[PDB]
Amino acid sequence: VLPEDPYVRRFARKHPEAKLVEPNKVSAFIPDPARVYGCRVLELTKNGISEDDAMSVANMEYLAERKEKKKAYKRLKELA
Amino acid sequence: EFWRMTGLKREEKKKARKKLLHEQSSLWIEPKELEKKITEALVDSTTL
Amino acid sequence: NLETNADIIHIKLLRNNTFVTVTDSKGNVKCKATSGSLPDLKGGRKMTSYTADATAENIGRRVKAMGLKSVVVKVNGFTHFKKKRNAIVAFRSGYSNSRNDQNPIVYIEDTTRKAHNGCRLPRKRRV
Amino acid sequence: PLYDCMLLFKPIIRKEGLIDLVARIGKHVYSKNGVLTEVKSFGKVELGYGIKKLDGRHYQGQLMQITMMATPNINKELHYLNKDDKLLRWLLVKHRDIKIG
Amino acid sequence: IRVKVFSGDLDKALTILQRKMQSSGMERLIKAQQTHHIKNSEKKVLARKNLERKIKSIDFARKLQSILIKKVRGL
Amino acid sequence: DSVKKKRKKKMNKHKYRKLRKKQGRK
Amino acid sequence: KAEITTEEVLKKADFRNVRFLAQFITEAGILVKRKQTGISAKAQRKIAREIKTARAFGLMPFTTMGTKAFTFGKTMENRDQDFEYEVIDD
Amino acid sequence: MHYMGLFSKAGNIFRQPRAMQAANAMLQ
Amino acid sequence: GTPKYLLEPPKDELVQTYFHPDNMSSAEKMKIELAKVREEFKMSESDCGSARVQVAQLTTKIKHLSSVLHKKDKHSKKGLIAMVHRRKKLLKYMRRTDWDSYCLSLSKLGLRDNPD
Amino acid sequence: GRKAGNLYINPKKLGNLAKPCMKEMVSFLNCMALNNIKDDKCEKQKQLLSVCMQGQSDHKNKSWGNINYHLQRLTRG
RNA sequence: GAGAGUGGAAUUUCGUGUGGAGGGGUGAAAUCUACGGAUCUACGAAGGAACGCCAAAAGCGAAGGCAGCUCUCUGGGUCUCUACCGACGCUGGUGUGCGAAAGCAUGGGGAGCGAACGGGAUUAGAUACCCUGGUAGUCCAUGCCGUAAACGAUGAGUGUUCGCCCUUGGUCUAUUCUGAUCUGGGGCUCAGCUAACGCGUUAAACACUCCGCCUGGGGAGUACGGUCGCAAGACCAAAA
Ligand SMILES: [K+]
Ligand SMILES: [K+]
Ligand SMILES: [K+]
Ligand SMILES: [K+]
Ligand SMILES: [K+]
Ligand SMILES: [K+]
Ligand SMILES: [Mg+2]
Ligand SMILES: [Mg+2]
Ligand SMILES: [Mg+2]
Ligand SMILES: [Mg+2]
Ligand SMILES: [Mg+2]
Ligand SMILES: [Mg+2]
Ligand SMILES: [Mg+2]
Ligand SMILES: [Mg+2]
Ligand SMILES: [Mg+2]
Ligand SMILES: [Mg+2]
Ligand SMILES: [Mg+2]
Ligand SMILES: [Mg+2]
Ligand SMILES: [Mg+2]
Ligand SMILES: [Mg+2]
Ligand SMILES: [Mg+2]
């Protein structure tokens, strides 16, 4: 059991379609989105921030990153 | 102290049931208004 | 222009006999036939499928002969459904000779009821 | 205890006969130190089979329900409803926490 | 169970009546109807044998299903 | 105790029941 | 297929609720097995007990072999237009 | 168990292989 | 969202009638009576499981069951006999351990002394 | 019975032991029963029985009994 | 578990319409039953017994056993608790109680079934198996009896021992679908055990406590004696 596991399973209580990292089959040492979300929430809790605020800011940062890679892929398609 | 708290919660639940039953008793039937309430219950005609 | 009181063909399958009875809509018998009342079969066996088919065929011929154009078939018996299907098909095959004239049967119905654990059945035979 | 008295009347019984029987049971409950909390009518219902009485066979009925807080002896004391000609069926059940609609 | 005949089609109505006989469980109860008395001591033995043949049929169906599902998947 | 051994006791009991109903009836 | 849950049965099954209970009888009028609905054994026991009560109370049929199919709200009296037939099609 | 404990504080080394996920999809 | 009964005045005489012991089943009356007996015999204030409390409760149950049980009801009579033998075991424990509570129970419940 | 083991279905545990022209034969015999044992005026049943006989002549004795080998080879796989 | 009520299907009998030749039964027959009108068909009446489906490797009970539904009264069990109490426990000779079915006593009841028995057949014979009638009995009330392949052919209890799949009834956690922990009931199995078959956390495993019982077969669960029983018989139970 990992300390971040409840937060990883709380990320499973959301949008399930996130990444093709599991059948990518390139390496077993890069974390996926849910594990890094849970680690972010865990280290925020270890800082002393509130719990719900930790999930809110971690989800907002993830959504910002996903929109930024969406617009980056849009730039790739505009160059393509 | 834990036993006293348990007894207080049990007594509070019993008092809550008693208060609920005391509020609902405004629609119960006196003998002097029995046939009137039977008439109104027959007129109202709750569905099947 | 839509009629209600069709005649009823009662078919009763027993182990040892078959009873085909023609009534009106209210249960008044007009004609009937059993296994032993058929003019051809004489002794030996009555539990065959052929006897039940022949009884229904006989009644179908008689029902055409009295000009009945609409019937309701009610079947009853503790047998497989294939036996009752073959009995109904025989009736129509007697009313019409080879599937040519229109169907008189406007309704079919199975009426078989079990005891809800009623009386004790007889003792098993030791043969 | 709290009970539901189900009353299935014959469909030909008029309003006055229904009221008379319901009020007779109600005055019986009051005389045994009891409270009537609820009386309701389910209207006319269609039966699953034809209930056969000395009058004949009935395929309809009027359904009533009285909810009472009464003595434990009251189902035994209500056995006169077995000889009542306005009734098709009657049944006393312990009150349940189910919504009947 | 009553079935209407539509457009004089006897075979379709008979198929519908057979299907409603089978799917209502009434055919299974008619086939199970007995002609003689069976004691409870013999009902116990019959129930034991019926459970044994049900176990064998379930095992056989499981083996066929595992073979067919493993073969159809293309492995 | 097999059925074959039960049969010896069965016959002893039948003969004894027969003798007891013949003698003790009188 | 109608997915009925255990909690729905434990909330709804009563011999007064004939509209709900009519789902658990077949067209021959006999009680459906538990494995056809997937409810709990306790829920199936409650359904069987309430339908037996409603049968003895007259609201549900013991059997529909030889009669018309049971529907809630429809009469079970055998009437002339039960076996209504058409001759003008012939 | 020191090394497994260190490497469990990482990404996902507990990822099922393709054959196990295939059989789990087969069984359901 | 206001229910219908929260508009009319409540009826206090009907609530008093509702909670009358004539409207209670025999099991509820036994529960109330056994709680009273347990209050009468307790050693501490939260005491509900000492030997003399169990003896007094068993005596009350035994006296109720010996009067209400039908002669043909053998299955309940076996449980009544079990209650009798449990009370003997508890009295035997109290006779060697707490002689004062033993004499208390025998005097107040009217039981014989049978050390044999 | 058969020896217990593996999977085995019988080649004759299907519809195979029903030789044809049976209902045609009993219908033709029924027409002799009705029409006082004459071949006249119901030659349609005679023609159907004959055509069933040439249909049996066209048909041949075939049965797919190689299912057991396929089951045995799927067990080994 | 006991008491009090109540429901429908089916069988049998009876009645009333319609109808007319058989029905019933067998390997094949016959007795039987039917023109005084049967079987069959509709409606009705009476009565007794058993409760279809649910429904079963489910549930409950010490065992024997317990099945429609409602209500009354009532025995036991399970779960949870930062509640009580404080070794009050296990087993159990002699004893006491409960105890299928058949049987007995008294009074009711009697549809179906059916020892005995009558008849029809089979057979070399047939005191049988098959058919047709059918008494006691089977049911209720109150007593007696005290036995069964009363079987898991496995006494009761306690502690310990790798797991997997189901399932009854709870609780907790859940992260939307499942895990955990009790509780009984099943299937499979690592060990270990077993003459072998097999058993296997509900042991026939690793140990223990207490009781009952065995000591080659036959004679024999017989004789004698005592106690119990209205009887039928039961329990303890030899020797040559
Ligand atoms: K023996
Ligand atoms: K149990
Ligand atoms: K118990
Ligand atoms: K349980
Ligand atoms: K094994
Ligand atoms: K153990
Ligand atoms: Mg033989
Ligand atoms: Mg031995
Ligand atoms: Mg007896
Ligand atoms: Mg008598
Ligand atoms: Mg003779
Ligand atoms: Mg005989
Ligand atoms: Mg007889
Ligand atoms: Mg013995
Ligand atoms: Mg037994
Ligand atoms: Mg559970
Ligand atoms: Mg277990
Ligand atoms: Mg051994
Ligand atoms: Mg012992
Ligand atoms: Mg003896
Ligand atoms: Mg002696």
Side-chain angles (χ1 to χ4, degrees), chain E residues 10-60:
Chain E
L10 202 59
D11 202 292
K12 173 67 171 170
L14 259 68
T15 306
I16 290 177
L17 185 60
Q18 180 155 22
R19 183 66 250 152
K20 295 170 88 134
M21 281 289 108
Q22 197 68 277
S23 69
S24 66
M26 200 70 241
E27 185 71 26
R28 192 189 71 185
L29 300 190
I30 287 170
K31 287 174 180 171
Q33 164 69 43
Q34 272 287 340
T35 49
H36 59 266
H37 176 67
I38 304 183
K39 290 196 301 167
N40 295 109
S41 46
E42 186 66 25
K43 285 176 178 178
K44 278 178 169 73
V45 184
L46 263 62
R48 180 79 199 179
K49 292 186 182 293
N50 178 260
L51 168 67
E52 288 177 359
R53 78 185 84 153
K54 195 176 104 196
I55 283 157
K56 192 169 74 170
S57 298
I58 287 284
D59 188 80
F60 188 51

Side-chain angles (χ1 to χ4, degrees), chain C residues 56-81 83-118:
Chain C
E57 191 186 16
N58 191 289
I59 280 293
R61 291 179 67 252
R62 296 189 190 164
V63 175
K64 171 162 276 295
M66 57 173 84
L68 296 173
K69 67 192 182 298
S70 291
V71 290
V72 177
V73 170
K74 290 185 188 167
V75 293
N76 191 4
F78 290 112
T79 58
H80 282 58
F81 196 79
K83 209 190 161 176
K84 318 181 178 175
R85 181 177 181 170
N86 289 337
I88 298 157
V89 175
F91 174 83
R92 188 205 176 182
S93 179
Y95 180 86
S96 82
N97 295 20
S98 183
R99 294 182 179 95
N100 289 337
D101 204 78
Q102 70 261 25
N103 220 332
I105 304 165
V106 294
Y107 278 99
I108 53 173
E109 163 176 18
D110 195 282
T111 65
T112 315
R113 280 180 185 174
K114 294 164 53 77
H116 299 168
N117 274 353

Side-chain angles (χ1 to χ4, degrees), chain I residues 8 10 12 14-15 18-19 21 35 49 52 64 67 76-77 79 96 101-102:
Chain I
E8 278 95 346
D12 299 17
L14 300 186
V15 176
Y18 199 99
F19 281 92
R52 83 201 203 179
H64 171 78
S67 86
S76 300
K77 281 224 178 302
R96 54 170 189 168
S101 293
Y102 183 74

Side-chain angles (χ1 to χ4, degrees), chain I residues 41-43 50-57 94 101 104-105:
Chain I
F41 266 83
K42 47 180 202 166
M43 302 201 298
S50 67
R52 83 201 203 179
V53 170
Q54 292 181 58
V55 159
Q57 277 167 200
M94 281 196 292
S101 293
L104 189 83
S105 291

Side-chain angles (χ1 to χ4, degrees), chain I residues 46-112:
Chain I
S46 63
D47 185 29
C48 48
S50 67
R52 83 201 203 179
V53 170
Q54 292 181 58
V55 159
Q57 277 167 200
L58 281 160
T59 305
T60 299
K61 279 182 161 187
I62 279 161
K63 273 159 151 81
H64 171 78
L65 279 188
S66 182
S67 86
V68 306
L69 281 183
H70 198 278
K71 195 192 176 299
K72 188 184 287 185
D73 196 3
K74 310 196 184 206
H75 284 50
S76 300
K77 281 224 178 302
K78 181 164 178 284
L80 163 73
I81 295 311
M83 283 169 207
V84 170
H85 282 118
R86 177 67 74 201
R87 189 180 68 180
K88 290 202 200 176
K89 277 174 155 84
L90 287 153
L91 283 168
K92 172 185 170 182
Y93 175 68
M94 281 196 292
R95 202 193 188 276
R96 54 170 189 168
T97 294
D98 203 357
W99 175 254
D100 293 14
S101 293
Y102 183 74
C103 289
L104 189 83
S105 291
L106 268 67
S107 301
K108 217 194 290 178
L109 301 165
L111 312 171
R112 285 186 308 280

Side-chain angles (χ1 to χ4, degrees), chain H residues 1-27:
Chain H
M1 286 165 272
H2 186 248
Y3 291 106
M4 290 312 277
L6 289 185
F7 281 117
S8 61
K9 292 179 179 179
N12 219 335
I13 62 165
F14 310 103
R15 221 184 306 250
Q16 298 207 328
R18 59 186 186 273
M20 183 176 282
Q21 305 210 47
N24 279 17
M26 193 85 81
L27 286 173

Side-chain angles (χ1 to χ4, degrees), chain C residues 22-43:
Chain C
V22 173
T23 65
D24 54 354
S25 64
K26 292 186 181 295
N28 303 281
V29 180
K30 295 192 278 182
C31 66
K32 38 174 172 69
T34 80
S35 290
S37 68
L38 295 188
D40 188 45
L41 280 77
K42 287 304 170 192

